[PDB]
DNA sequence: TGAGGCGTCAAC
DNA sequence: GTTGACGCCTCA
């Protein structure tokens, strides 16, 4: 139905705590619950994050 | 019983 | 045309 605006660096801050957050880091319902966002989103961010990074151009 | 992975469609 | 949103199957 949606598609917001997101950024990568969003992107990246949910994959970023998604991978370091004690409150997610290991799990992608709890980052998508915690960032209010969808599940699936965090798992095809990481099937191009890599392409995340250099969007953002940092890192 | 609860968590992780992939595909297709409409709006961006 | 690609990305945000949604579901079914399998493992411990």
Do not use: M
């Not at 994959?15 to 290991?26: A, F, P, T």
């Not at 599940?39 to 969007?55: A, D, G, P, Y």
Request: charged share 25%; proline share 2%; hydrophobic share 25%.
């Amino acid at each position: 139905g949606s598609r917001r605006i997101f950024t990568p660096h969003f992107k990246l801050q949910v994959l970023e705590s998604y991978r370091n957050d004690n409150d997610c880091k290991g799990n992608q319902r709890a980052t998508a619950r915690k960032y209010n966002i969808h599940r699936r989103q965090i798992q095809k961010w990481l099937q191009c994050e890599s392409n995340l990074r250099s969007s953002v151009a940092n890192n």
